Design a protein around this ligand. Sequence first.
Ligand SMILES: [Zn+2]
Ligand SMILES: [Zn+2]
Lengths: 38, 36, 103, 99
Amino acid sequence: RRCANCDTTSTPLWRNGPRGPKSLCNACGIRFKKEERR
Amino acid sequence: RRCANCDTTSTPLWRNGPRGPKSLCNACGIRFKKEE
Amino acid sequence: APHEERVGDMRIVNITFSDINSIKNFQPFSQYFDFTLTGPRYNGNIAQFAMIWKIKNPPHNLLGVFFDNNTRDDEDDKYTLEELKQMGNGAKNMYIFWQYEQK
Amino acid sequence: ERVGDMRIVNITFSDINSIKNFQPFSQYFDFTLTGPRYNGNIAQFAMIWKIKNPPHNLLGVFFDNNTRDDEDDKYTLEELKQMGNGAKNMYIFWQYEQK
Ligand SMILES: [Zn+2]
Ligand SMILES: [Zn+2]
């Protein structure tokens, strides 16, 4: 598995993203969730 | 006035507590009501 | 209306405000808030200023939770918002108050 | 030592790997990241936001509860001590040195 945003192979948790479930690393998935706050 | 438990001076309602009337802030007095 | 979630007979109402000060003027719900507390709270029963119990691990912009009916477990830092949605215990509406985050 | 009701807990470790044995710090630390991070909320491995201009040997900052503004390279350690926003403990993780 690889992060759609940062291309990392190493994360403690694969997270939801624009490209699908489990598509972002833990850091990018948390940034994404922050971005989607309204 | 100050809450005998948490020491706040701001509360929407002073409540009775084991130490005396109106001695607890709103939250502390609701917690006290819960624990008997 | 159509996009609103339900849990059993309970409707989940997410109402958004500019800030907690706006909620002070919101009848008939302001009377249940305790506006001196830090962090969002939920009520264990119906009573004035009843929303004092601290919600655990809250998400950003959550300002409080008001169950309009019945009673439930009343503990600080024990129930997350998701647990609370299963704790209506007969309430017909769960009002969840949110702060607007400007995008 | 205390900001309001929040306690400031400095903990010094033998190495960053030692944090893996610590509950509950091990479920919030993201060990794959470079540079010390803080959490803006409670979530799994939530310590991901970059602390600004971090002092040497700082490993991370964990706020035990509540939420705060979550941005990269915006807040210094000293700013973060004022941003508990209801957390009862702010844990500040340090790598020991021998000087
Ligand atoms: Zn990523
Ligand atoms: Zn009190």
